[PDB]
Every structure is written in C-alpha cells, then in structure tokens.
Design a protein around this ligand. Structure first.
Ligand SMILES: Cc1ccc(-c2nc3ccccc3c(=O)[nH]2)cc1
Ligand SMILES: [Zn+2]
Length: 208
C-alpha cells in the first residue's frame, strides 16, 4: 500500500527537510569510522512516504499516548538510518527493526543529528560499508535515510556518555553528558509510535 511521491527541489517542504538534514551534521568520536568523513551531503532526492494503513496505525497510537499524557503526544521529527529502510517504508516499524544491543535496551532508535543516523545505513558500526566498494566512507554510492514523525509521550531521561518502556513512560531520551556538541537520541519500544514520513537519497561529500 506504499507509494513514494517525489518532492521538487523548489518545494518549500523539500527545502525545510534538506535544511534539517544538512544543519544537524556533526563530528563523531570515531573520527568517521562508522559513517565516513564529511561535513555535508549531496541530496539527490526527497520522497514523501504515503501509506494510509500505516498512517492510521501511527495516529491511533498517538491518540492513546496523548490521552495518557495530558493531551500531549510530544511528537518530534527525527532521523533513522537502517539496513531495513526498504522494509520499513512498506511494512512499518516493528520489533525486527530494533537495535537489540542498544545502550537503552532493545528498541527502535532515532537521532536529532542526521550524521548519527548515517552511521547505521550500512548496519551497526557501519557494518562493512557500501555493498559495491566495502567502504564505510564511500563518496560514490547512494545512501538512504528516513526523516520520521515520532511520538515520545512521557520520556524517561538518561544522562549518558523489544524491551518495555520504563514504567510510567512511553520512550527513553539519551541526553549527551560529555560531548557538548552532540544532540539527543531517542528510543521507542512500540513500532506504532513512528511513521517514516520522508525517504532521503544522498551521498556524503568529501571535505575539500
Ligand atoms: C539494526 C539497527 C540497529 C541500529 C539502528 C540505529 N541506531 C541508532 C542509534 C542511535 C541513534 C540513531 C540510530 C539510528 O538511526 N539507527 C538501526 C537499525
Ligand atoms: Zn560504494
């Protein structure tokens, strides 16, 4: 039931998504090992992901959360990188898409920094890099990320350097406590709490 609609680069919606992508790049403590070395991207395409059943699944859960949290879904737009991007856009997020070994337990992880999600496009730790060249810092091969609508509800705050949500909470927030430039990361434990709104196709760019 999924169709993908291309956005024009002249469309204000394309432009605002590209700006969130570019402006949330940061340097990583691995020196580029997992995601590659880059300061910016070449955006090749942005598509809207349209699936009525998957949208209604999201809004149903969003209302449940809202009603448990004084009419506040605490909805964010966050990045997700995964080897399962093609399954997610067709079938929706579920337990198969969780990071079993994540530091906040087995759940589905999202980032404010697009470059954090870029570290997972080719698997945990960048896996073995692109399929064609086996290069985690490949500047040629086309990558994909999702920019997702995510319901956090009442979020458990962890101050740091599928399972269940902590009792009385709908998500976990990983607050950075050492790297002053890192943005927050988030975990949900129910696939119904995220919708893959935009599929972004891009390359990382070699710094000059
Ligand atoms: C199988 C698998 C594992 C981890 C990710 C993943 N982990 C993250 C951890 C922190 C912040 C963002 C992400 C992310 O986008 N994907 C996706 C799929
Ligand atoms: Zn490659």
């Amino acid at each position: 039931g999924t169709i993908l609609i291309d956005l024009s680069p002249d469309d204000k919606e394309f432009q605002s998504v590209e700006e969130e992508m570019q402006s949330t790049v940061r340097e990583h403590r691995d020196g580029g090992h997992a995601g590659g070395i880059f300061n910016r991207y070449n955006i090749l395409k942005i598509q809207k992901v349209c699936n009525k059943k998957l949208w209604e699944r999201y809004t149903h859960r969003r209302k449940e959360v809202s009603e448990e949290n004084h009419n506040h879904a605490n909805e964010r737009m966050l990045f997700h990188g995964s080897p399962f991007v093609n399954a997610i856009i067709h079938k929706g997020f579920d337990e198969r898409h969780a990071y079993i070994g994540g530091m906040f337990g087995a759940g589905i992880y999202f980032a404010e920094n697009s470059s954090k999600s870029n570290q997972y496009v080719y698997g945990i730790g960048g896996g073995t890099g692109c399929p064609v060249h086996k290069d985690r810092s490949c500047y040629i091969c086309h990558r994909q990320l999702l920019f997702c609508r995510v319901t956090l509800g009442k979020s458990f705050l962890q101050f740091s350097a599928m399972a269940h949500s902590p009792p009385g909470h709908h998500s976990v927030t990983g607050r950075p406590s050492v790297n002053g430039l890192a943005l927050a990361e988030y975990v949900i434990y129910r696939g119904e709490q995220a919708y893959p709104e935009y599929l972004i196709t891009y390359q990382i760019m070699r710094p000059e």
